[PDB]
Design a protein around this ligand. Structure first.
Ligand SMILES: *[C@@H]1O[C@H](CO)[C@@H](O)[C@H](O)[C@H]1NC(C)=O
Ligand SMILES: *[C@@H]1O[C@H](CO)[C@@H](O)[C@H](O)[C@H]1NC(C)=O
Ligand SMILES: *[C@@H]1O[C@H](CO)[C@@H](O)[C@H](O)[C@H]1NC(C)=O
Ligand SMILES: *[C@@H]1O[C@H](CO)[C@@H](O)[C@H](O)[C@H]1NC(C)=O
Ligand SMILES: *[C@@H]1O[C@H](CO)[C@@H](O)[C@H](O)[C@H]1NC(C)=O
Ligand SMILES: *[C@@H]1O[C@H](CO)[C@@H](O)[C@H](O)[C@H]1NC(C)=O
Ligand SMILES: *[C@@H]1O[C@H](CO)[C@@H](O)[C@H](O)[C@H]1NC(C)=O
Ligand SMILES: *[C@@H]1O[C@H](CO)[C@@H](O)[C@H](O)[C@H]1NC(C)=O
Ligand SMILES: *[C@@H]1O[C@H](CO)[C@@H](O)[C@H](O)[C@H]1NC(C)=O
Ligand SMILES: *[C@@H]1O[C@H](CO)[C@@H](O)[C@H](O)[C@H]1NC(C)=O
Ligand SMILES: *[C@@H]1O[C@H](CO)[C@@H](O)[C@H](O)[C@H]1NC(C)=O
Lengths: 343, 203, 221
């Protein structure tokens, strides 16, 4: 009664047209208010196939957020190799709002129900919602500052585990808190006790598909500062937190040992607000004004990892933090969805 | 954990011959051709799919973990090493040789010159002239003792005249170590020999 | 038209560093990873690692992690990409030819390769060759073979001619092999008639143009 197809999806939102922040501003002249009562036509005994790495919905979400950052958080001077531009660079409120994405009439979004679904292959339990659940679009490398969590066991996501060129996405089960501040040279704060427990159980799942090997965690192997260093954006400020002591441990025999230089039972990552930024959206460099005066703090809860396995021959797989392409972030949320035409 | 093996190592055929090589693998396999001292050339990808611009006489069949590469009607321009590749892993490959009659190598051995002894170094050169196939085994023996880790050997290319090869091994050691022994031998093994042949000399 | 242009042959002393470039052009460069391979004499291709053009993210095996760093440099309209491979602490077995290649698809098929650059790790500066005679002390039939020995020179190459170019029949010049001392060494032998000794003058002509060294040598037992 249905087949797979492509459609120009529209976004649903619970935003407000009276807010200062550029997210509510955008999500009103670009999105349609929520239902908020969608129908859950859930039925069993029907199997469907999904693929989070070749999914059409991801590219559309990538497009709208691109227009968001471009017209919202405006820089001072951009460089496009042979053609620069100068404009006004006003500071503004910057806090993401959870968004939805819906299919028009004649089309339908299929939803998997197997909470242990990795991201590719068939799925026994299917349902149909006209839209998608509340999803917060957070741009962040290495770590996923905000997202959902599976109440079930930890799931590993990759287009191919055998392919070391494919970025690995780790969907956790328990939330891990992260606090990045700028008192009146910044820094993050992560609870080592929780962090040790998380990487303990991550290794158990990594040693499932790679049993014989001892799992490791080394810092990034190099590249731009945006990818090597865990970069994000709090209230419009481009933070770059040194992660060299965050990913510095070893997992063997069902136990994980972290180095990490924890000077007070808490992981401290030296952050720094930059003004020269390699743009993730368009190819070029964008310059910004110095931070705001006062406190700059946002309490985040990392729900996922972005890792890349090193290739070669030693019965010991080392994993370094990755990312770069912001599509992967939204694949870890849209993994359970797919566009399907009713006709 | 990717396991890949390729057979055979040595291979010989004439012009217009139909040739086949096999490579056991558990992943995406690609076939390559590499001429001497040059970059590898892609031929077959995904075990079957033919690369554009590549002669149609090349072909590959995929089933299970067994991968074949087939070259119908061999050509002189096809004499090169062929290696199969899965992801990060590359097998040494199969060397394609211009087929000829099995021939025994003419073994020679040359004692170190006096001028070199002045320098404090001594080099003994064993010679394997005009032979086929390429596969040969040269072991150095000093006072009935096998030498390991002090000998280098260079092999010439297949001649367009007689289609044979030449091998020159060189035992390198100090004059101090050269003047502690007497008999210097040179054992050579080849498919064209009834038994290993030794050529020695004394001081 | 997609072409990957690598740098010229580089000779570096051990311990020091070397840089191997690879000018990529003629395609949608950002959408394809660039991998590196090295080729020691004979053996098989060795994976050095890949690099993400847009990101700059490298991926090296543990045997290279620390000594190698893969970087890139864009152009004006991005029609030219410069992929740099830096190898910090060079050792003896780092001497090889490195190949800049392009990952076309997820099948890991490499359709476009560079010509390659000869990286020779040695600290021999520039020296002429030492010519040593090869002759049979004891006459046991041996149908007879003799030659010369080109020893301890740098760098390549050495042209070897017999009897000022007269003798070409049965002449075999062997490819030079790089010794552990950081000096090249080859040998050239010729098959001579058994009765030719004494009634024939055998002279080899070793030429080393880099160090401007040409030596004539006469060999007889
Ligand atoms: C299908 O999945 C839903 C959760 O999304 C669950 O409530 C329901 O029990 C599942 N159906 C069956 C038969 O297990
Ligand atoms: C997902 O499950 C299928 C089998 O149902 C398996 O082939 C595939 O490798 C899995 N994907 C991941 C990301 O592990
Ligand atoms: C985390 O996942 C492990 C996998 O077995 C599970 O045992 C544990 O209960 C989970 N903890 C959480 C997040 O509740
Ligand atoms: C790390 O976390 C695990 C799981 O919570 C815990 O059992 C273990 O004691 C911790 N390891 C160390 C040595 O602190
Ligand atoms: C993540 O979500 C938390 C809770 O709503 C919020 O306080 C925080 O600002 C978010 N992190 C960022 C910077 O996106
Ligand atoms: C992060 O900090 C570590 C420790 O000082 C340093 O070695 C590393 O270079 C830093 N990373 C970057 C790329 O700034
Ligand atoms: C785990 O490690 C301990 C030593 O710490 C060893 O005694 C035990 O055999 C190991 N168990 C397994 C199954 O690896
Ligand atoms: C791992 O952490 C320790 C403690 O900070 C540090 O000394 C070491 O250099 C780190 N290793 C890296 C950078 O991979
Ligand atoms: C972090 O996530 C957990 C999930 O249970 C939530 O309880 C907590 O309020 C979050 N912290 C904040 C304030 O973002
Ligand atoms: C991943 O790649 C391997 C390469 O052999 C292939 O066998 C496997 O089917 C791939 N997994 C999928 C279906 O994505
Ligand atoms: C591969 O070729 C061999 C002969 O060389 C043949 O025996 C075998 O059937 C072939 N494998 C397949 C499955 O095509």
């Amino acid at each position: 009664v249905w087949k797979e197809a492509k459609t120009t999806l529209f976004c649903a939102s619970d935003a407000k047209a009276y807010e200062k922040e550029v997210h509510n501003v955008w999500a009103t002249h670009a999105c349609v208010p929520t239902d908020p009562n969608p129908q859950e036509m859930v039925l069993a005994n029907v199997t469907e196939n999904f693929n989070m790495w070749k999914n059409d919905m991801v590219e559309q979400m990538h497009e709208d957020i691109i227009s968001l950052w471009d017209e919202s958080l405006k820089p001072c001077v951009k460089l496009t190799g042979g053609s620069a531009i100068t404009q006004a660079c006003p500071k503004v409120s910057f806090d993401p709002i959870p968004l939805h994405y819906c299919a028009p009439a004649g089309f339908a979004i299929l939803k998997c129900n197997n909470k242990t679904f990795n991201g590719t292959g068939p799925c026994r339990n299917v349902s149909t919602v006209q839209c998608t659940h509340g999803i917060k679009p957070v741009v962040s490398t290495q770590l996923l500052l905000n997202g959902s969590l599976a109440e079930e066991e930890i799931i590993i996501r990759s287009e191919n585990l055998t392919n070391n060129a494919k970025t690995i996405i780790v969907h956790l089960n328990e939330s891990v808190n992260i606090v990045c501040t700028r008192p009146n040279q910044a820094h993050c704060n992560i609870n080592e006790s929780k962090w040790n427990n998380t990487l303990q159980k991550v290794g158990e799942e990594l040693a499932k598909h790679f049993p014989s090997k001892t799992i490791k965690f080394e810092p990034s192997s190099g590249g731009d500062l945006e990818i090597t260093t865990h970069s994000f954006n709090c209230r419009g400020e481009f933070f770059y937190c040194n992660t060299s002591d965050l990913f510095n441990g070893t997992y063997r025999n069902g136990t994980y040992n972290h180095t990490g230089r924890s000077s007070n039972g808490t992981i401290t990552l030296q952050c720094k607000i930059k003004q020269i930024i390699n743009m993730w959206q368009e190819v070029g460099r964008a310059i910004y004004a110095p931070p705001i005066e006062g406190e700059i703090t946002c309490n985040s809860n990392i729900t996922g990892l972005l890792l890349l396995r090193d290739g070669g021959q030693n019965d010991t797989e080392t994993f370094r933090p990755g990312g770069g392409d912001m599509r992967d972030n939204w694949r870890s949320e849209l993994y359970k969805y797919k566009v399907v035409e009713i006709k | 954990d990717i396991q890949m093996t390729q057979s055979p190592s040595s291979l010989s055929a004439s012009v217009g011959d139909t040739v086949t090589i096999t490579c056991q693998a558990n992943g995406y396999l690609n076939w390559y051709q590499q001429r001497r001292g040059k970059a590898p050339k892609l031929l077959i990808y995904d075990g079957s799919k033919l690369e554009r611009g590549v002669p149609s006489r090349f072909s590959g069949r995929r089933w299970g973990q067994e991968y074949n590469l087939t070259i119908n009607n061999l050509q002189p321009e096809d004499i090169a090493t062929y290696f199969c590749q899965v992801y990060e892993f590359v097998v040494p490959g199969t060397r394609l040789d211009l087929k000829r009659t099995v021939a025994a190598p003419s073994v020679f051995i040359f004692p170190p010159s006096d001028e070199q002894l002045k320098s404090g170094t001594a080099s003994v050169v064993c010679l394997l002239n005009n032979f086929y196939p390429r596969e040969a085994k040269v072991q150095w023996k000093v006072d009935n003792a096998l030498q390991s880790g002090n000998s280098q050997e260079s092999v010439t290319e297949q001649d367009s005249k007689d289609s044979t090869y030449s091998l020159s091994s060189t035992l390198t050691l100090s004059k101090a170590d050269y003047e502690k022994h007497k008999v210097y031998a040179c054992e050579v093994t080849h498919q064209g020999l009834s038994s290993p042949v030794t050529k020695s000399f004394n001081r | 038209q997609v072409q990957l242009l690598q740098s010229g042959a580089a000779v570096t002393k051990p311990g020091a560093s070397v840089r191997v470039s690879c000018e990529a052009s003629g395609y949608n460069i950002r959408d394809y990873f660039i991998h590196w391979w090295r080729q020691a004499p004979g053996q098989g291709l060795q994976w050095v690692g890949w690099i993400n053009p847009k990101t700059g993210q490298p991926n090296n095996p543990r045997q290279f992690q620390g000594r190698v760093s893969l970087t890139r440099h864009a152009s004006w309209d991005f029609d030219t990409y410069s992929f740099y491979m830096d190898l910090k602490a060079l050792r003896s077995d780092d001497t090889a030819v490195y190949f800049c290649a392009r990952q076309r698809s997820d099948y890991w098929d490499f359709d476009v390769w560079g010509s390659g650059t000869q990286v020779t790790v040695s600290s021999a500066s520039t020296k002429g060759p030492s010519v040593f005679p090869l002759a049979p002390s004891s006459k046991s039939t041996s149908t007879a073979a003799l030659g010369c020995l080109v020893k301890d020179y740098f760098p390549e190459p050495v042209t070897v001619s017999w009897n000022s170019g007269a003798l070409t029949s049965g002449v075999h010049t062997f490819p030079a092999v790089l010794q552990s001392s950081g000096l090249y060494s080859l040998s050239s032998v010729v098959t001579v008639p058994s009765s030719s000794l004494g009634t024939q003058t055998y002279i080899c002509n070793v030429n080393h143009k880099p160090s401007n060294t040409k030596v004539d040598k006469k060999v007889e037992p």
